[PDB]
Design a protein around this ligand. Structure first.
Ligand SMILES: COc1ccc2ccc(S(=O)(=O)N(Cc3ccsc3)[C@@H]3CCN(Cc4csc(C(=N)N)c4)C3=O)cc2c1
Length: 222
């Protein structure tokens, strides 16, 4: 993500890193000891999920590595538009919870008031490189009508927009599936946005997690 800075070490216990073939693929969010939420467009074979990570180059005493035994994309995911861009990953071994590994509660209320949020990830930074250390930035939800003007005809009820007019803080390539956190609840997942990245005129677009409460519960419960 661009124009942010390194997260406080203790502030992102829910953040997941997704790898395939030994390389960073996407972000993700721990929502249950057994389940990680990420973007549908992240689906690949041989996924490895890392929890409790802060710096990707280090072997951190807090980190846990797990394979996935089940990857459940939403049935109605549309690759072209990123509509319904959400996937549940069933961890092969339950998260060893600690100070630095904790699930994040979902925002189940689509009418939730809090518009001050933050995003996190190991995706591309403003200099065009990929950071070792996880980045964080404060951004704000943008009203649906604001965002529809930004991407006329292309924004569904399954999408949320968020950005920062002052610095243009924004998620970027490699941040997919990472948490948009508002009021300390999971409000969205990094889905798509402007390229080059930066939200000064076009906000980032996020999967509207509140819409998927039932589908998540049914899947975890199956
Ligand atoms: C993790 O390492 C890489 C390395 C090179 C990359 C080149 C392109 C992209 S991408 O932008 O096209 N990407 C495709 C993808 C990534 C993992 S699985 C498929 C998606 C496309 C949506 N997205 C987030 C995003 C792009 S711009 C943006 C924003 N808020 N402005 C957010 C991505 O990162 C992602 C890349 C990720």
């Amino acid at each position: 993500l661009v124009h942010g800075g390194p997260c406080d070490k203790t502030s992102h216990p829910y953040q997941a890193a997704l790898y395939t073939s030994g390389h960073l693929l996407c972000g993700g969010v721990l929502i249950h000891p057994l389940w990680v939420l990420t973007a549908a467009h992240c689906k690949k074979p041989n996924l490895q999920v890392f929890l409790g990570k802060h710096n990707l180059g280090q072997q951190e005493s807090s980190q846990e590595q797990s394979s996935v035994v089940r990857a459940v994309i939403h049935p109605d995911y549309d690759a072209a538009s990123h509509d319904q861009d959400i996937m549940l990953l069933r961890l092969a071994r339950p998260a060893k919870l600690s100070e630095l590994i904790q699930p994040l509660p979902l925002e189940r209320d689509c009418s939730a008031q809090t518009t001050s949020c933050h995003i996190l990830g190991w995706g591309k930074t403003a200099d065009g490189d990929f950071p070792d250390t996880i980045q964080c930035a404060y951004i704000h939800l943008v009203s649906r009508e604001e965002c529809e003007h930004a991407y006329p005809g292309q924004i569904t009820q399954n999408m949320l927009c968020a950005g920062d007019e002052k610095y243009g803080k924004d998620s970027c390539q490699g941040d997919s599936g990472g948490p948009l956190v508002c009021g300390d609840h999971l409000r969205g997942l990094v889905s798509w946005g402007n390229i080059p990245c930066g939200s000064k005129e076009k906000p980032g677009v996020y999967t509207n997690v509140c819409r998927y409460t039932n589908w998540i519960q049914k899947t975890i419960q199956a």
